Amino acid sequence: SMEQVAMELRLTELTRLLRSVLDQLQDKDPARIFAQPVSLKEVPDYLDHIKHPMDFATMRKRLEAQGYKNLHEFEEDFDLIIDNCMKYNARDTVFYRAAVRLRDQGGVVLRQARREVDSIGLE
């Protein structure tokens, strides 16, 4: 129907917005600590600690399959990346500190993304 099409146009423009956001978020991770899933070969007991792993590559796959219906779902995954890291890694590690910096810098991007989502009405 025309309705389904209109909906899909909105999802596509949401996806376009979120792709930009993801690219900006990933720029705040120059070391690329969060670029890929934690390796179960290098950390074989990771899943004993973290029940819902997340990383930027995994987000990008969901993103490109238009799997984020709204900004909230996207933010959920971004928060997983940060929160998983700050539990698994101790406070005085380069890993924990990278997540803190990513959280803080990312918040600026996500704050304006929320306004753009609401203003354009993409949800």
Residues that bind ligand 8RV (CB under 6 A): 33-34, 38, 42-43, 85, 88-89, 95
3-class DSSP assignment, residue 16: helix
Neighbours of 23 (CB within 10 A): 12
Neighbours of 109 (CB within 10 A): 18
3 vs 42, beta carbon nearer ligand 8RV: 42
Query: Please, what is the minimum distance in Å from the beta carbon of residue 24 to ligand 8RV?
Result: 19
Nearest to 18 by CA among 87, 66, 85, 76: 66
Query: Please, what is the minimum distance in Å from the beta carbon of residue 87 to ligand 8RV?
Result: 9
Query: Please, what is the minimum distance in Å from the beta carbon of residue 63 to ligand 8RV?
Result: 19
